[PDB]
Amino acid sequence: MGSMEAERVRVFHKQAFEYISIALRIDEDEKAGQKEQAVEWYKKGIEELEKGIAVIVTGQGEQCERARRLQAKMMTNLVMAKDRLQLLE
Amino acid sequence: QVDMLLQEMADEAGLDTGSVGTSVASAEQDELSQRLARLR
């Protein structure tokens, strides 16, 4: 039912994915030390992941496990991204 | 509606809900994780 929740997660993912994909793309191209163009993008990404994680996904359903398992994957990437960000800042 | 593997290429190159949408996001996250870990 409360699957509006599982959606709210997916919308946040869509954004995280966009922003972080751009970050990685830039990050990957820049030499060293103009890598700092990615920063803006990691930040916006990180922010989307965090809003994703925040969503309480409350319910029983095999689909609901799947959503929360998704939030866990966002957690994993929130952390790796913050790590990379810090390395760049 | 769109084949989920199309969705993923779309999303990946910045172009153009339900249990299928979740499969998309799940796979896209895994890709992010692979992509970040490569950076080390």
Swiss-Prot record, chain A:
Impact after mutating F17A: Impairs binding to CHMP1B
Domain spans labelled MIT: 13-88
SS bonds (residue pairs): none
Required for interaction with microtubules: annotated segments: 7-89
Region Sufficient for interaction with CHMP1B, residue ranges: 5-89
Tissue: Expressed in brain, heart, kidney, liver, lung, pancreas, placenta and skeletal muscle. The short isoforms may predominate in brain and spinal cord.
Subunit structure: Homohexamer. Mostly monomeric, but assembles into hexameric structure for short periods of time. Oligomerization seems to be a prerequisite for catalytic activity. Binding to ATP in a cleft between two adjacent subunits stabilizes the homohexameric form. Binds to microtubules at least in part via the alpha-tubulin and beta-tubulin tails. The hexamer adopts a ring conformation through which microtubules pass prior to being severed. Does not interact strongly with tubulin heterodimers. Interacts (via MIT domain) with CHMP1B; the interaction is direct. Interacts with SSNA1. Interacts with ATL1.
Family, as annotated: Belongs to the AAA ATPase family. Spastin subfamily.
Name this protein carries in UniProt: Spastin
Gene, per the UniProt record: SPAST
